[PDB]
Design a protein around this nucleic acid. Structure first.
Lengths: 92, 309, 292, 93, 281, 292
DNA sequence: TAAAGGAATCCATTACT
DNA sequence: CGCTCGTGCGGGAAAGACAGTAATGGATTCCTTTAT
DNA sequence: AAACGGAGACCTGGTCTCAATCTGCGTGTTC
DNA sequence: AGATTGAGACCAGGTCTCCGTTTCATGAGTCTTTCCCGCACGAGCGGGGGTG
């Protein structure tokens, strides 16, 4: 099973604890977990519905030559595609 | 689907029965629910447990659990086993992970029929001892022979690892001891019983509808655990008892080696497959449109939720 | 052969020497371990390892439930670790003749004014649907609540009529109690006679016995007595938990479960829905201490 | 290649920018990459020698039941092995 | 080992030449080293490039790159190619990623010997077209056959994808990039040239010591690139030109398709192994 | 046969029509690119895409260096994108006859008096080592700085004698400028004659020519006057930087590289450095416009 | 005169580099 | 026909050569006080 | 002209704590 | 009694601006040979349909 990382900032406490129920909290708001595509999509839906007015960002093992891809919900750091390569873009 | 709520999860949102971790031992700590999270508070801090990724949870001596913690653990399919001293003390589980009962119906059909029960016990004995033939002996002969071979394996491994065995055998019902060998066997078997209980509960099978063991609610748990106690838990506990030095936690090393054995032997996928093949369930990848249905004599299943005016 | 369905909530259970203790805000209770048959652990309950070990040693069945059993959350083992109820249920559901017998028995106890022993499954279910419609109309006209047709979405609870929401909440609060009783007695919720193919099939089969007598009147009473914008599901659950406080429904459920499985009257255990501080004078002669 | 995650908190800006040559920064102080074992070990050694008085934690694919393991260097949250299984432990103030 | 300095890294601390990404195109931006990180700044914001995981870092029009930025890019073995309009305009590279010059001295030995040069030219032509036999062809004959085959492939792919084509064989030195087919070919070809340059500079080989192409500093780059050009880039560019829409960025689509081709064909590992067997190691 | 070596630092190069526009704080310079041979982009320099376009069009050899070439960071193409020097170096290093001839020429220009026609390659190495010891002792007695053996720890620069640190820093600065000149000219640093098997073998093979006469005296001087508590690497780098500011060392290196490869004197190109704000008087006739 | 002895002279052997 | 564990080939690093000197003991030589 | 480190400035987001309110997550004879 | 939520509080760390100090972290007077580690290679089971 691939690897998934979810970073949550300014989200309800319930979402943080619920993710700790699925994936462990390495850092404040930073979770890592091992599971397949189906569970990953279900967890992303959970985060999307129960994040409220906060930002979420999930980095998951994928099929690009970097080896990972990004899905961000209302996140400060956008994801910009340089010709097939996801790069984290920080607006000024 | 419906709205997503913290603390409640669908069966699909959780890993399958065989894809989870095996077990966790917790002692001298309090399990509670905070922020919709199962947290074990020790004397120094908190540990958030990925309950969705853990098949069964073991509770040692001096351990507290809260009502909300129990229902939260039951949400994710994690089973509670109070593994105190002298073996497993109590079990607990929530609703079954599997909404369908295609396994439980077949288990009931086999356990009720005497011929099918004999066939299933024979298949269990074949899986434990594949060399022999079991086409002739009866139930009492099966019990006597399995007990004889169990104590034969106990004596063999005790001689091999040079540990003193007082002509005993491990049975979770009233097994007490203080020797390192007894503690190692208890620690190695409580994990197996907890894992078996979790796998049976998560499959919808009845823990009470046993074939070889009868007379209690955890007979089928014992029967399914017997298929692997001889192969896995006994040699591992013997090796732990032999290897351990003075002033070493025999339980901790026993559980470490037990988890190593579970990962190496692929006991979880093997256990799911064994449970599927004992009940003669053909492989069927198609998923039913609706689990619940009303029962009819001539039309067999008839859809539910409709008013017959 | 009596089972004490002791209900614990807002408490922290531990063990003193050989008897569990209760640490409710009212005081301290020291129930002997052998006294408890089934311990219904309600919300705000902290059960300890020593207490669980002692209760398991005596065959006590621990069921983590909601307030007065409205929701079933988790269950331990059976009462006294017995399995005769489960084996009898399996025997009666496996073969068709016993399945017809028990389905007819359930329909007959659901039809007190008629004898339905000759009807087949199609006629039985048609009669059940007609009775459901008649009861819906009767309780609609009694409470002056409009009623057109039972419509709901399992995936959308909010987007429903208040009547349907109240009925769903009350029926689920009944399913919780039925599942709690089934798990405490040791039966298997999956092996149902009329309903089949689900984890909670036998629970629905047993709960249909009390649907028309408890949950439907409660749902219609809540729907009638409700202002616009109020959370009607909470009201229905609270009214249903108020219905379960007395414990008569619990004893009725235990007796009905015995009757369905053709248990001989000598083998019929009787539930004793005890309350801690409501029955102090009843429990002091039995060895229970009530400290404050 | 196994996925490696490094979280940095209160470290000199030199390291914070330097890791971005290997691992992208999804959020403040969080870096994700895909390396082999040797490159990841050298990255952890570099983080150890550069972070100074700071907090660093790495998670990488392993061969246990969960499938990941942690190396924490002067981090608030420790790692405790529950009989061979890594669980993050949070000391209480 | 010794102390680690932010912005300085050993070669063992880096991914191999095979394990890194292909390239990144940057245009109308400013590469700049801030906090010891190569950051491309645009109007909206900034993006920090993972230099250690990228082979070549192409630079588009309107691109200003600092001094410490080039120092840091050369540290991680990332080569720079100033990809402007109508072809590659300039190259740049750090020192090297390999501390052993065995491959370089072997290449020099093979290029200074006329018989060895002819042998390597025959091997490269056979590697381009394995169905033919050229054991008796001279150098001029080999060059003429290469030209004929590449023009034939160009015309064949022109008819295959049903697109106008002027038979203009791509020469990066002052190319004619007016047409959408020309733009797509240039967009793929500059990426291939940048990748070849990055690999050659990372393996220690001399870009000037060429076998078929000679007379300038990037001859061996052109040889190695021409080895895969007709087989990778040309079909991709012709598909992009054929599969196109009005108002669609032809360059971005071409670069996406050529990166997909590079990943699918494993042209990076293939390039390294081809250099291995082409130099007798 | 003319090659301009312009060192641009603390500046920002752009392009207007056909001439690069250096934007130093002193003023704006408008050097035509047709006469630029080598552009040493020193620290604090910002090059633009139009500038690189124009320079690569004219065959300019951009080299990103440190202060006056103390460190070599990156390089572009060569003069006029020519590879004749590289071809000659390869043809001279592949065969042992020419390689030995070039090594002998190296030794004889390092030591004009000693005969080389009888010394083999390892004989050359041994003699070079002996003369290096002699030079080290002579400069040690001239500058007081005592001289225990050269103990260069590659991984730990802090641990060592101040004189050892001075030698290391001066030598790496010399390697940097030698590499800058070699990369600008177009030769490969790998193809070394005396030194072999490393990336910069030719760089050491050109730096040993000037080590004893430039960097060793500099290192001994800086160690002699080194006060306690001062880092020696920076001082040695700065002193070598100044020696390179003088500008004749680059001319000598280009001349010696042309001598090693027996390049005919008719076809040899002569390199001269150009400082913008120090040599503007010669630049004005060339068309280099200035603005203050 | 010459033994004689050690210090100094010149030489030989090896470790330093 | 896609998965693992045991078999190894491109990197290393480490000694180990290759050349001659510096210092000290031995052989030689000179003095220099020993004894006379 | 760049890039850094140090020293301030400042801000947002995480976390602890105090009342206050509830005990909770709702199909299964509806189509 | 246990858990959640809102409010209100505090505060550690992040980000920015400003400022002065840098252009930097510094081997190869010599190397080949013999050692190694590599992270590739490796092969079988698969699981087929076929077998029964």
């Amino acid at each position: 099973m691939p690897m998934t990382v979810i970073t949550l900032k300014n989200v309800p406490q319930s979402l943080r604890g619920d993710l700790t129920r699925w994936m462990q909290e390495i850092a404040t708001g930073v979770y890592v977990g091992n599971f397949n595509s189906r569970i990953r999509e279900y967890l992303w839906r959970r985060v999307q519905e129960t994040m409220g007015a906060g930002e979420a960002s999930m980095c998951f093992a994928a099929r690009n030559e970097l080896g990972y891809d990004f899905l961000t919900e209302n996140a400060s750091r956008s994801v910009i595609d340089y010709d097939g390569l996801p790069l984290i873009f920080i607006p000024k | 689907a419906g709205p997503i709520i913290a603390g409640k999860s669908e069966s699909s949102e959780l890993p399958r029965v065989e894809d989870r971790a095996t077990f966790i031992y917790i002692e001298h700590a309090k399990i509670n629910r905070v922020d919709s999270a199962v947290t074990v508070a020790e004397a120094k801090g908190v540990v958030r447990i990925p309950a969705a990724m853990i098949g069964v949870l073991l509770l040692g001596p001096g351990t507290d659990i809260s009502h909300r913690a129990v229902e939260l653990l039951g949400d994710t399919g994690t089973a509670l086993v109070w593994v105190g001293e002298q073996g497993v003390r109590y079990y607990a589980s929530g609703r079954a992970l599997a909404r369908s009962t295609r396994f439980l119906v077949k288990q009931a059909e086999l356990v009720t029929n005497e011929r099918s029960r004999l066939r299933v016990a024979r298949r269990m004995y074949q899986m434990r001892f594949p060399t022999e033939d079991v086409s002739k002996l009866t139930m009492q002969q099966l019990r006597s022979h399995e007990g004889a071979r169990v104590r034969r394996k106990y004596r063999e491994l005790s001689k091999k690892y040079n540990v003193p065995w007082k002509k005993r055998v491990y049975n979770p019902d009233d097994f007490a001891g203080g020797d390192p060998i007894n503690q190692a066997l208890s620690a190695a078997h409580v994990a197996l019983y907890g894992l078996v209980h979790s796998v049976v509960a998560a499959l919808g099978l009845s823990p009470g509808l046993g074939f070889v063991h009868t007379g209690h609610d955890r007979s089928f748990i014992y029967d399914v655990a017997d298929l692997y106690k001889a192969e896995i838990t006994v040699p591992i506990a013997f090796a732990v008892a032999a290897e351990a030095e003075e002033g070493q936690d025999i339980g901790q090393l026993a559980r470490l080696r037990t988890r190593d054995a579970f990962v190496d032997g692929k006991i979880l996928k093997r256990m799911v497959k064994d449970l599927q093949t004992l009940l003669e369930i053909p492989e069927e990848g198609q998923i039913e449109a609706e689990p619940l249905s009303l029962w009819d004599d001539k039309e067999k299943l008839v859809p539910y939720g409709v008013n017959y005016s």
